[PDB]
């Protein structure tokens, strides 16, 4: 069949996504860190030297990741499984070539290990990049596996992607009742801060930085940079329109109210206000201090006496708060998508192992300067003693803060949480959704809903479903599915092609003619104007399509801030886009024919200029075409397939454009807690918790995402025979009735596998754990609980553990000759089954014992269910078969859930899932319900009724109870329905008495450990409401903590044992009962200086 | 400190939903202490029951003192507190 | 993992119809839906148990731990 | 209120310090290492 353009230019998604995956930010961000921004830490900190011995210096060559010369190949590296097996971390040597002077003139190389780096998976260092799933069988790891985590200690953790505000660009915003402020937050490699700029009052614009004591005036700081005519500061910053000169005029007239100013002068006035360096360079405390000041408040690093690029961009930044005060709606939203960036895990990995290598360098001068210190028989040979044991240092940094997740780096100040997170393993699409995980910058005033709303300006980029619920609700975001994230590539050379295509240097421009011609910003900085902005744009842009620059470099102008800007910097996320020139789309087909036939993967659609990538920005100068039916001549690109607006968990939806949004989102998030299958390794696996399905089906109505990400692979549901109709009265509100016999069959049924890890801890008394045991009786058997426990003391692999049974029999030294019995003792409702004992040993020659413990489950009353259309609920009750309707052929539903929730939630998807099944499974073809498309449903009618169905899936069935014809026709078809991780036997609590708090001996406060249910001080509203007085005393009081305390009558303090114990008289004493929070509280106060003396009375004598 | 003599009474003559449950609470309390019952049970162990039951016969012997906010006092038999 | 042995629905041997579906696929190739119909499976959830059952037990295996 | 002992204003100043009770402050068992792990207010009270 000839290829269609129209419908063939999707194909274009398979390409990209084969050579771009979807954990693709980390594993690039990862490579691009230990390929190059190794080599940049190892450049900037090349030589340490001493202020003794000045013939001698520490010299850093190289640096390298996993690779010595010795041999062309890699070390060996203990494979990830074999790290998450033995609880290590997968990590890599870090390898350096050391220049370090000999006593005797001599000079020499090395390859030195100092430290260990923990390597993402499937990166370049990973043993796992380009695998053949055969090697991948050998090396026990999941061929599907997202990789682009790290194992520390065994555990997967994932630097999830971070959102945050540009740097280095200026952001401007309003207030009422209080000003406008606007602000430039700019990073350097080394000093961060923010230039803020408010007017504080009678429209009068001020410059305050942290580093200067009060806001200087903005006249001030634009007649120190140079700009001193105060006629020409009037011209940049107003232009030629009348109201902004007179919004302006203020702090014009106050640069003279001061006293008259040279440049030096205002220099003289900044300098005077600088705070402190910590006292050192004392002699700097002149005018000259100013010079450093103005050096460090922004990213544009003077190194000259020419100060015009600094006081054009703080020129620029007055014009846009006069621009403001003039009248709102000029500010930026910070919520925009363009005004966003994303970190990611190399970035990060980047800047904390620079942080931890200027601390190694810091301690291995330390330790050199304490050695040299000495004044004789200074022996210069192995002076590397020192960096063998102090290599340890590096490793425990890189891996602690991966693994707890707070990020101390002393350099930059400042104390983040959160960086990392355990890598989800309740289902393959929750591991690849916590891939391509966004999260957002914290501090962000949760009270307010700007960062929470869904902007229109993230279509394409950001997931519009895939939004979590609860808490963090439009805090985390997910990626789309076409989507890359730009990297940092070099500005200089950008500068100069600008130049060459007509942009004339502010230098050589003049105040009086900046604001009549176009101003061209490279990362926000005016580095020029050009006249022809719409060709200088144009030309721009065929430069990028032949290939003379860089693919994510945005170029856009906009007309309200006449300015054509150019953005080169890493972290601003973009989607591909088919170029429409002329009126027509760039492909015409025979690039698709290429395409399918082998030829032209996708990054030649890039050199050929027939694709280009759009960031947020560039996407307001563009007009782009849905389809190539509506591309009318002036749309400047075309979407390669509109589905991709959903990311990979929303692609799981059939149907999703015929449902309600909310649906969507709860759908996305019950997909990522749906129960089915892990990897193919997942029994070689052993986590913390493991629920898996035993017969997982691949859904009958599928969509292209969910055979992109190969979820019907690994899939995570089953396709239950379903009739929708009121049914038993056990159904209402989401509740659901299941088939018993459907249950027998293995519908539903999945298992839970649990590991429980222990450490046979050496001590320093030469002692250690043992694991022997198994006592027997008299009669020769084991007593019951080691009843399965075997002769090495570790649990038979195979037997069943019941609560109260032992399957580790650990001992503890009562030295830590005689050891105490701590075993690991079984506590769950229902028996397991040991399917796994792995002994082994850390790294540390430490005795590491893991037990895997298996437990099959039933479907039962209360379990969830969901039914990939935000549709949950549990089994309200589980009926016999012959109870269940059937239809003429005897086909009965294993679930039948209640017309009730359809019409409210409005899933229309819901139903055309089912017809789709129904058509597809009597067609023999999986149907597809692919976003904005998929399967028509008069096709589907047409296929229902060539088999005898009806068209609109309605079929008459008859009672199973009564045998009649149901007097409606019954919504009967395949859904899938996915078993939720919330199951009831894990719910199931109850307690009666037990185990109390030790300080406030009330009930314990965890369903592990035999917890009390709180009764809050909502609960206690309600029983006052109610006037129920008994009842708040005996829930209260009786039942949580009851104390007779002896109270004196004389003086309101408690006794002891019928004693005052502060008149020592026993007399006055009384008996009665109290909270024992009461009794609390009070000896609490007696501590303080507050004596809360209790007054009594009799309750009787009336 | 004054009980108000029986013969006028400004106190409500029906027995209020927190009067029932008190005395029924205090019944079942004495009947689970052992206390004699004045009704028969037909074959009624829970303590609770038997006191609804007298409730019904009406033939609890507790009486009600309803204070006055001013500190006085009239008693109530749960007899005459109709319900 | 492996093919159920019953119809979830029915009850209907179906475990013992995933050999002799997957040689009408290969040998003398048909399409699924009748494959399916030339098994005997006519009701639509024995249909379905076929049809959309994903065989990991062979993905497994890759990983015996005892060869 | 200087009717009673205590009244006087000078015992508003801290010159005796009540130390709690154990129970205010309890010491926890076998914590990380083998010994027992105390407790803020013991800490603090040791401190002064
Ligand atoms: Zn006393
Ligand atoms: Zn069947």
């Not at chain 1, 390859?111 to 780096?117: A, L, P, S, Y």
């Not at chain 1, 709606?329 to 970190?343: A, C, Q, S």
């Not at chain 1, 509506?630 to 990979?648: C, K, Q, W």
């Not at chain 2, 013969?7 to 449950?21: C, G, I, V």
């Amino acid at each position: 069949d000839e290829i269609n353009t129209a419908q063939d230019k999707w194909h274009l998604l398979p390409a990209f996504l084969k050579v771009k995956g979807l954990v693709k930010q980390h594993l690039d961000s990862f490579n691009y860190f230990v390929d190059t921004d190794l080599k940049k830490i190892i450049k900037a900190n090349q030589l340490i030297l001493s202020d003794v011995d000045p013939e001698f210096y520490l010299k850093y060559v190289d640096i390298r990741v996993g690779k010595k010369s010795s041999s062309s190949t890699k070390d060996y590296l203990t494979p990830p499984h074999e790290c998450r097996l033995r609880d290590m971390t997968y990590s890599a040597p870090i390898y350096v070539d050391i220049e370090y002077t000999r006593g005797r003139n001599i000079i020499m190389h090395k390859d030195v290990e100092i430290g260990r780096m923990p390597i993402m998976l499937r990166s370049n260092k990973c043993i796992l990049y380009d695998a053949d799933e055969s090697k991948m069988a050998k090396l026990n790891e999941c061929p599907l596996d997202p990789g682009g985590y790290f194992i520390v200690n065994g555990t997967e953790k994932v630097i999830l992607v971070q959102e945050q505000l540009s740097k280095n660009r200026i952001i401007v915003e309003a207030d009422e009742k209080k000003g406008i402020v606007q602000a430039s937050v700019t990073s350097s490699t080394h000093e961060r801060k923010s230039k803020t700029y408010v007017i504080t009052k009678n429209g009068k614009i001020y410059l305050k930085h942290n580093s200067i004591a009060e806001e200087i005036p903005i006249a001030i700081v634009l007649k120190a940079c140079g700009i001193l005519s105060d006629l020409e500061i009037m011209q940049l910053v107003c232009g030629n329109d009348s109201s902004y000169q007179d919004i302006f005029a203020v702090n014009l007239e106050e640069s003279s109210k001061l006293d008259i100013y040279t440049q030096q002068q205002a220099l003289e006035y900044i300098g005077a206000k600088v705070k402190t360096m910590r006292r050192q360079k004392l002699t700097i405390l002149q005018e000259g201090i100013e010079a450093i000041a103005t050096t460090v408040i922004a990213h544009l690093t003077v190194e000259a006496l020419d100060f015009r690029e600094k006081a054009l961009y703080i020129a620029m930044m007055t014009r846009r708060v006069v621009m403001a005060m003039y009248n709102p709606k000029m500010i930026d939203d910070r919520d925009y998508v363009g005004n966003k960036r994303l970190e990611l895990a190399g970035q990060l990995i980047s800047l904390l192992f620079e942080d931890l290598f200027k601390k190694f360098n810091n301690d291995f001068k330390l330790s050199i300067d304490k050695v040299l210190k000495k004044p004789n028989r200074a022996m210069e040979y192995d002076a590397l003693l020192s960096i063998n044991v102090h290599s340890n240092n590096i490793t425990s940094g890189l891996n602690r803060a991966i693994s707890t997740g707070n990020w101390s780096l002393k350099r930059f100040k400042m104390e983040r949480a959160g960086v990392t997170h355990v890598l989800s393993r309740l289902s393959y699409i929750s591991a690849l959704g916590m891939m391509t995980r966004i999260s957002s910058q914290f501090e962000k005033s949760r009270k307010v809903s700007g960062p929470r709303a869904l902007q229109p300006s993230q279509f394409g980029m950001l997931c519009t479903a895939d939004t979590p619920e609860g808490e963090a609700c439009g805090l985390v975001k997910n990626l789309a599915l076409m989507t890359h994230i730009t990297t940092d590539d070099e500005e200089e050379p950008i500068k100069k092609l600008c130049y060459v295509l007509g942009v004339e240097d502010i230098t050589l421009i003049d105040s009086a003619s900046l604001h009549l011609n176009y101003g061209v910003y490279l990362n926000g900085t005016l580095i020029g104007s050009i006249r022809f902005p719409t060709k200088f744009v144009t030309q721009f842009r065929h430069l990028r399509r032949t290939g003379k620059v860089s693919e994510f470099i945005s170029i856009y102008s906009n007309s309200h801030q006449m300015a054509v800007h150019i953005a080169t910097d890493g972290g601003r996320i973009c989607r591909p886009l088919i170029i429409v020139s002329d009126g027509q789309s760039r492909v015409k087909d025979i690039h698709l024919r290429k395409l399918l036939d082998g030829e032209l993967d996708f990054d030649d659609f890039l050199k050929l200029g027939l694709v280009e990538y759009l960031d947020v920005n560039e996407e307001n100068d563009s007009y782009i075409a849905l389809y190539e039916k509506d591309i009318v001549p002036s749309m400047t690109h075309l979407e390669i397939e509109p589905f991709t607006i959903l990311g990979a968990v929303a692609g799981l939806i059939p149907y999703p454009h015929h449902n309600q949004s909310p649906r969507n989102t709860y759908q996305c998030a019950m997909g990522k807690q749906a129960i089915g299958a892990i990897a193919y390794n997942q029994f070689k696996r052993i986590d913390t918790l493991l629920y898996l399905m035993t017969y997982p089906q691949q859904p009958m109505v599928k969509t292209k995402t969910i055979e992109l990400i190969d979820y019907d692979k690994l899939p995570a549901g089953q396709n239950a025979t379903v009739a929708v109709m009121s049914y038993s009265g056990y159904d209402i509100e989401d509740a659901l009735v299941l088939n018993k016999s459907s249950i027998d069959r293995g519908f539903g049924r999945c298992e839970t596998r649990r590991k429980t890890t222990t450490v046979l801890k050496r001590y320093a008394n030469h002692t250690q754990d043992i694991i022997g045991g198994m006592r027997v009786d008299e009669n020769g058997d084991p007593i019951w609980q080691h009843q399965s426990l075997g002769p090495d003391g570790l649990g038979e692999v195979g037997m069943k553990v019941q609560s109260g049974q032992i399957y580790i029999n650990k001992s503890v030294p009562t030295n830590s000759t005689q050891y105490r019995e701590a075993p690991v003792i079984y506590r769950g409702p229902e028996p397991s089954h040991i399917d796994q004992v792995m002994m082994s040993v850390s790294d540390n020659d430490q005795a590491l014992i893991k037990v895997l413990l298996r437990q099959n489950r039933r479907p039962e009353l209360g379990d969830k269910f969901s039914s990939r259309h935000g549709q949950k609920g549990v089994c309200g009750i589980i009926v016999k078969q012959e109870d269940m309707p059937f239809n003429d052929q005897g086909i009965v539903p294993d679930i039948i859930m209640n017309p009730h929730g359809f019409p409210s939630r409005m899933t229309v998807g819901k139903m055309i899932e089912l017809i789709s099944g129904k058509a597809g499974v009597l067609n023999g073809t999986l149907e597809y319900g692919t976003c904005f498309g998929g399967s028509k449903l008069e096709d589907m009618s047409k296929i229902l009724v060539d088999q005898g169905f009806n068209y609109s899936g309605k079929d008459m069935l008859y009672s199973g109870i009564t045998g009649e014809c149901l007097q409606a026709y019954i919504f009967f078809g395949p859904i899938y329905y996915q078993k939720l991780k919330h199951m009831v036997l894990d719910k199931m609590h109850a307690r009666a008495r037990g185990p109390r708090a030790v300080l406030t001996r009330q009930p314990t406060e965890g369903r592990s450990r035999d917890g009390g249910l709180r009764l809050g001080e909502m609960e206690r509203d309600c029983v006052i409401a109610y006037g129920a007085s008994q009842l708040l005393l005996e829930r209260l009081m009786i039942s949580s903590d009851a104390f007779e305390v002896d109270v004196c009558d004389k003086c309101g303090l408690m006794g002891y044992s019928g004693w005052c114990t502060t008149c020592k008289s026993a007399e006055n004493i009384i008996k009665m009962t109290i909270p024992y929070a009461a009794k609390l509280l009070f000896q609490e106060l007696l501590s303080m200086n507050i004596a809360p003396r209790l007054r009594l009375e009799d309750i009787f004598q009336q | 400190e004054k009980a108000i003599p029986k013969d006028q009474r400004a106190t409500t003559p029906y027995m209020t939903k927190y009067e029932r449950a008190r005395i029924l609470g205090t019944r079942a309390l004495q009947i689970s202490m052992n206390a004699p019952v004045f009704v028969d049970l037909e074959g009624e162990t829970d303590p609770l029951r038997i006191a609804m039951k007298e409730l019904a016969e009406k033939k609890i012997p507790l009486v009600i003192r309803r204070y006055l906010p001013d500190g006085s006092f009239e008693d109530w038999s749960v007899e005459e507190l109709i319900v | 993992m492996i093919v159920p042995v019953r119809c979830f629905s029915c009850g209907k041997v179906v475990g013992d119809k995933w050999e002799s579906y997957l040689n009408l696929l290969q040998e003398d190739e048909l399409d699924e839906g009748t494959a399916l119909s030339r098994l005997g499976l006519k009701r639509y959830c024995c249909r379905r148990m076929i049809l959309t059952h994903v065989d990991l037990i062979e993905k497994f295996l890759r990983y015996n731990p005892l060869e | 209120d200087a009717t009673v002992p205590s009244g006087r204003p000078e015992t508003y100043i801290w010159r005796y310090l009540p130390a709690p009770p154990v129970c205010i402050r309890p010491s926890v068992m076998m914590q990380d290492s083998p010994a027992s792990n105390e407790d803020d207010l013991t800490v603090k009270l040791t401190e002064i």
